[PDB]
Structures are given as structure tokens and as C-alpha cells.
Amino acid sequence: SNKYIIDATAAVNDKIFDVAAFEKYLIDRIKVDGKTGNLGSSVVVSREGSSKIAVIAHIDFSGRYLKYLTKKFLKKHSLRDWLRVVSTKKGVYELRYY
Amino acid sequence: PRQISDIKQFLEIARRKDATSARIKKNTNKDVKFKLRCSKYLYTLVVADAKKAEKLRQSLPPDLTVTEVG
């Protein structure tokens, strides 16, 4: 139902995080009902192209949770100073540099 | 502040000298609110039909001060 789009064009251009790395991080950290990879059919994560990640969920999907999940990868990569997550639009999250 | 739902009354109100100026505010709901400030009350008429609002603006008295959206 609800569609969540995360823009990774800036990350791909700056090579901060690859689309596959984002997809692998998203797959390994998708705590659907507290279980990783438990998205099932209600929530489907399908990144169309290596510039963005799209998630279609039939249930509630918090953007802050996705941002919090995205913040862990940035903290792990230590790119928080040079890259910040921004709310481009309702349900749209993008990465912004300094 | 007295909202008026009668188009003819608003035209008659504009016809009388009691009216001072008329402001047409464009709302997000695409409804034209024709607000005319009189001596004792503020006459506001909200028209959803753009053509009706366009006709009302065209038919407004020349003496009235037509104001765009603030």
C-alpha cells in the first residue's frame, strides 16, 4: 500500500554507499515485527535501479524507523559528518552532504 | 465578520456605499473567498466555481476596490 522511497543518487555519485550495500543493509536490518527479513508479502522492498530504494508496505512503515535504520549504516561508515539524511518529501528520504 | 451566502445581496452590498473594498483570496481548496469590508461588518462570500467567481469579479461595481490574494 504505502510506498517509501529512499534516494541514493547522491550516495552512488559520491560512492559513500552503494545501492547493493543499502539493499543488503536494508534486508539485514528490516526488523519487521522485530524479525529481520520478515517483510513477507505485506511489505515488499524492491530497489528499482541503482539510484534509489522503494518499499511498498501494506501495513504501517515509519519513516523515522527507516531513517533510524539508515543512520546506523552512516554511523558504521562514519559518514554522518559528510552525509545527512533529509526528508525530501512525505515518504521520501534523501542523503545531503555538508 | 459576517459571512454572506447570497450572491445578489453581495452585489447589492457592493452597490451601496457601505462597502469599502473587496478582497478575493485564493484558498488551497480552489475556492474563491470574496471578502468585502463594510463599515460595520466584514462580508465574506466563498465561491467554489471559478467561472462564478470570474463572473462576480467582472460584475463587481467599478467603485469597489478589487484586491488580489494577499
Next chain:
Amino acid sequence: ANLRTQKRLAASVLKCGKRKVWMDPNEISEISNANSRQNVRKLIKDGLVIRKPNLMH
């Protein structure tokens, strides 16, 4: 030198307490000449002076 009347003024437009302000320690020259509220409003939009967020309940 004396920033007292300028910070106290800044807190008033800051709507919080006099101790709820903060600046860097190396811009004393350009804040000293800001006397009116319009000067401060220009400075807060610049961000040279700024509050700090509340820390916990």
C-alpha cells in the same frame, strides 16, 4: 568589551533566559556594534549567535 546590554537584548528576542545564549569566542568585533533589535535579528539569521536546545526533561 561589555556585552551585557547586547546579550540581554538577544535573550529577549530569544524569548528564553539570559543564560540560554551562545556564541563563538572570536567574533566580539561585529557583535559589539549591534545595538538595536533589527541588528540582532540580522545576526540570529546569520547564526553567529544561537540558543542551545533543552537537555532532557
Next chain:
RNA sequence: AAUCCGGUUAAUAUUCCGGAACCAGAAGGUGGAAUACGGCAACGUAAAUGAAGUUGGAGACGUCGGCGGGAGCCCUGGGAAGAGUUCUCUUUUCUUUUUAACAAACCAUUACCCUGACUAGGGUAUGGUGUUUGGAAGAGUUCAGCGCCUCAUGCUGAAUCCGGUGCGCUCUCGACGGCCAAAAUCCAACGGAAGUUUUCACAUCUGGUCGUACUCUCCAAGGUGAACAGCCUCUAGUUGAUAGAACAAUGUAGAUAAGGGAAGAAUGGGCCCACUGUCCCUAUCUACUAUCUA
């Protein structure tokens, strides 16, 4: 009798600014009706003569307790935004998320009237308490971006949402239970003197004098703790009262001390028992004073 919002200063706001209303008083003008009405009823409408004289209501009323209604604070869930934590765990943690004055229609805890001979069926009024809208997003608040030698201090986007909870706290109103001011001012009635109507609506005007800056009985978060005891934090406000420097005696104070336990802390208990620097016999420590320097 009658006003609120937002913004504005070096020092001002219900006063100033911008916007929006209300009151009182005043005349004439327009239009409306006018030469008052329906319901057994309580009562209702756009108006709908009233002299002298007579009457009433409000103003204008003691105190306490419990209950209901609402509001706000606080608490809490979801959404949005921002920040913080993280290999690890934490959809996490923290902060914020607005709608006045007044103007339009909607709605009883109570009482009255009709049917009934309390229960029960139909109406009646106050609608503080809400059901939308104007005011009113155009304002304010928070994010993201831009404008640029410049006092350019603007400009562009958005969001500014869905809720719930109360031996909580505050206040307000209302139905009960009891315990036992006056004056200013306003309205209405009876009344029937007189032979276009204004208490209907809209347009019109104006609203003097004085205090108003500033310093000090009212305003009063949460948690921990059983508690308004005690602490902590938040909000906010100080780091100010002459200091520095060293630590002997003296003096203040707080402690600990072997063995005895009134020979001079115990929990205190029932002369007895317990207890202890009261004493034998003082010793040690800390802090301050004392001491020096300015």
C-alpha cells in the same frame, strides 16, 4: 455598560502599529410592517400605542461537604520534523507539532404545561458547557533551499496531524446534602389620561479628564522518596559578601579510642540490667578560628 489578536522599542502596550469587533448617545433617511399574533398549555415571532397613579425583579448577597459538566496543566499512544546513542542490542532517547475577541445556524444534570390517577407518553427555558463556518492563515511556530560587496533582510517550499487518560492539580458552572450590606443603576408589570408605529432592520457621527516607566500580597514542573518530610532534575537565576598563602599552641565544632564502666552512646530498658572519654587519663584526626601576606 462596552476589545481581542499578531507584530513593533535601548527602555511601550488589552494604550502604539496592522487587522477585526463591541458599547453608549445623537438625530434625521431608507425599507419593512403599521391605520400584532398562533398553540387547551408552558411558550414563540421583525414590528405589534400607554398619562397620572400602583407593583415587582435584577443589582443585592451567610457557611460547609459530597456529586455531575467543562477547561487547562500534567500523563500517554500514533503521525511528521530535528537532534543524540549504536560492530553489538535499542521502530530508540530527547524537543516541537497553534487558533483569540466576536459574529451565524445546532444541542440538558434541572423545572413547568398537556394525557394519566408514582411509574409512563407530548411540549416548554436557561444551552456556562459542543455540532461547522467567518474572523483565519493572509498570522504564528518548526524544518529544507535561495537571494549577496551591500540596511539583500528578504525570497521559495512544505508541515504545523490522529488521539486517549485523571483518589492527579487549578478553576469554572450545574443538580444535592446540610450547618446555621447599603447605595448607585436597569428592566418589567398593573393601570387606562391623549387620539400614524418604533422596544423592526439597514446606512451617519462622535466619544473629554487623570494614573500608565521603574525597584519590591499573587502566580509555583516532574521524579525519587509512603509523604507538602527529604533529595534530584527541568524551567529560570547567580558564581556576589575583601583575598592570597601556608596549617604549631590556643579557642569553637564534629568524630574515633584499649581495659574498667558513673570510681566524676545505648533503645536506654525492667533498685536492677544495658550503655557510654563523666572519670581513670587522656591520645589522635578533620574543619574553622587563630597566624602571616595585600
